[PDB]
Amino acid sequence: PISPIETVPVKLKPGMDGPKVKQWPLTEEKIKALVEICTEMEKEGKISKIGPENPYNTPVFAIKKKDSTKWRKLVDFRELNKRTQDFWEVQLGIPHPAGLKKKKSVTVLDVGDAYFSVPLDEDFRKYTAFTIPSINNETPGIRYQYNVLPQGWKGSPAIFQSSMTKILEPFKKQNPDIVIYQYMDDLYVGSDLEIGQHRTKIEELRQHLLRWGLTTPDKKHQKEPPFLWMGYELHPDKWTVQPIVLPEKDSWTVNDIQKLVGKLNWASQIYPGIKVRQLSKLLRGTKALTEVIPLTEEAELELAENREILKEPVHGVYYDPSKDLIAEIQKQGQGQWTYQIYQEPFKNLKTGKYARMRGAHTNDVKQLTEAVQKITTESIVIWGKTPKFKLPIQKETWETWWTEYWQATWIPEWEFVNTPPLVKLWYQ
Amino acid sequence: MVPISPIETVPVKLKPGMDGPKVKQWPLTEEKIKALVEICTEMEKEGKISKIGPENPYNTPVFAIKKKDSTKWRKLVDFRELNKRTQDFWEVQLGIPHPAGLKKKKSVTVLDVGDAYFSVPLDEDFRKYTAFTIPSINNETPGIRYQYNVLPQGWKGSPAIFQSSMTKILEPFAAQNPDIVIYQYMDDLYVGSDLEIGQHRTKIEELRQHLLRWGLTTPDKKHQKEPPFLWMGYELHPDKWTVQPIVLPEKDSWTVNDIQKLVGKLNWASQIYPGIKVRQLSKLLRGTKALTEVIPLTEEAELELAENREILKEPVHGVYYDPSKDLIAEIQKQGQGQWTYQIYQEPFKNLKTGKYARMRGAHTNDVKQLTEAVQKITTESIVIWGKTPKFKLPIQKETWETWWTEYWQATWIPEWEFVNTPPLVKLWYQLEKEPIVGAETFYVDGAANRETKLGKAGYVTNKGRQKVVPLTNTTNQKTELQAIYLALQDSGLEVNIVTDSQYALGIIQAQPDKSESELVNQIIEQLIKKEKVYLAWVPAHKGIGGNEQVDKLV
């Protein structure tokens, strides 16, 4: 029956050597955490020390998950993954689970319980090398390589996919309504059920996964830490590409109309049909900015037709699973953060807003990192792939502080907007 | 016979797809040959090399050099072709320790593993790849063929394997002795402790005892080196540290070298003595890249070397790190995009100092710069001490709040307190959020012809005030700023200004307090004198009120 003796073969692409990425500085406390963790990971055969014959390196650090006090280990496998051959197999990313984003509720489960009990290809382990650095580099950094499937790797879920399907067999047959997705170390579970009823279905699958792993005799014991007891709640049943809205006023100043026209002219790149001739006609002349201009009957109509156009959503807007997803974020002040997700300029697959005041608002960066997580998570639910971010932050600031607030086992790619969007208030 | 433990080899390979070289053995002199044979005979009797045959088609050119006019020679094997074909290793020397991060020690000793080095074997399947040949006398015999059995003293992978091998050996000793610290560099070995010289000297014995369990001969004798040690350009006392003395040279015709890096001499040493500038000396490399050139030392780069030889007068020592006491960093503004800092635990006892130079931007402001310096200092402090220092900064709390709350980018400074040491970093002006009631509205506009480089700039207002000025040799971007500049010059202390220039707005929204462009500075100059300024944008060519593109396209 059982035969986990064989290791699933993995390779890279020709011309691409393994990941050689510098380890970035860590703080004392996160160093201690990684010391004790890796001490036990080696004592559980998951990793093992290596000599200087191994030149490869992938950065590593330490986070703390939501509502938890236990230091966890994250490995920034972003360079290995993209160097890791496009995992051509039964799973390159699952058949598009579009029912997932329609469900009333969606709970996210950390299935980092994990990919242990599964060895790794001996010739490939060298490519998962990492260093635990020391303060001031006073002692040589502790080096390791993974002996089993590591968390954060893109090949890890695509290898366990043959194993994970069988674990979800009593389930998925009992509740054919429930959609189940898997991205990285995360297993997303969605349902059209009432919140009380929905919360119960998760506890069922939780006690159910206490069978194939975590607890129970062996049979089926083994596997990496059972840190799954938590689960965030998502409601994609409450979302959209938010409408562009114009002011409704009884009196308009020259400034008001100057802004209105600015906003409509911008929107016209998105909605062909927008006109501003009649609104601009009121402006003509050099009136003071605070002077009230009464709307003429021609201008009022043009405003009305503009509302119409904007009420109707954008046309010709389709997803393309080959192209990259791009997320832009703007800081609006007062803990408000707007964002857009698109593939083509002015073709938004999704816009939204974020305003959560927790560990805030005196730290923009803490707010921004959480915003990035939220937007990435939504983006995992909708298209099954993270977007490349455009963060309104100087590279240096972000690189110094983001790891202090990050709580996700995955990490998106990002770049840095250095020029202020003129279009900032238009997206509020 | 007391048995010793083997030193496990390290699986070395060549770069994939390649193989060992076959470099020509160049002809020698009879005396150089006679020297090498004696040398290679000794090395063989110790096990450092071995005799091989014709089965080995690999060759490395080995030669001889005199030992500074003496009776003894020196055997040199050119592994330069060996390193280009050897695989890469994990070097750990990258990112050396910084003295300011070390802790005080009562006693610090230096051992020597000169014999342990050749006690470290080489991977046998790789020894074949290390073969050299001594031409015989008169080429009337087959030259002797040798291979290494140990880490060769010129091979690419010799340090990394020596270091790794040595660490694995020291590990249990350092573990059962948590009350001491061990460190290794090259042939040296450092042991420190807070022990009385009796207990300390006896533990040094135990370490040599430890190394003899693997067959590593160690000095024991009263070592010919005492604190302070000279290490990586540092002077390391067991209680103090400072750089190896910095005396700025005295010359009249300073050329390319003695001012510009190179590696020395102010930046490598700005890590300990405070209030040091280098930009005016650094600006002497802008737009230049000469092999040799007596570069004109401006009278702006002497005033820096007048303070540099004022700070280098009284030498400063650096203290070691006390993990109990708090860690503190303090910053000062030095003007010209320059910033200086000291990190200390006790006042005036600087663990280390430093400087930050602003980035190569077109416009900028003090607050942004300070922020960067803070991040650099922060990242550096995590490297050295494993924590972020508490900051003292020449910026009011209220100032910091106004900036970050109203700044389009996300920004952050770790825990910090106001220190009142001028010049204080400030906001020079703040743009209104709403149009100002009662303030004149200046509609401005600027354009230029691409060909003639001729254009115009000016404004019209609600009060009837108008102006257009013709401009020679100018651009679209130039005329758009000039337009705003004019409205600023001619308006009262409060003003509303309407422009269509996305460019101009994007510059002024950035809130610079200084710029490369003089036209931007004159605007900044004008902004500062104003009470309230509201700057509004409208799209171009939509006949939007006031906006008369007709006055500038003429």
Ligand SMILES: Cc1cc(C)c(Nc2ncnc(Nc3ccc(C#N)cc3)n2)c(C)c1
């Ligand atoms: C050159 C060197 C020497 C040693 C003993 C170490 N290891 C180490 N680890 C923690 N604290 C101190 N502290 C320390 C204090 C004074 C001296 C002198 N002279 C040397 C070291 N050293 C290191 C990292 C470098």
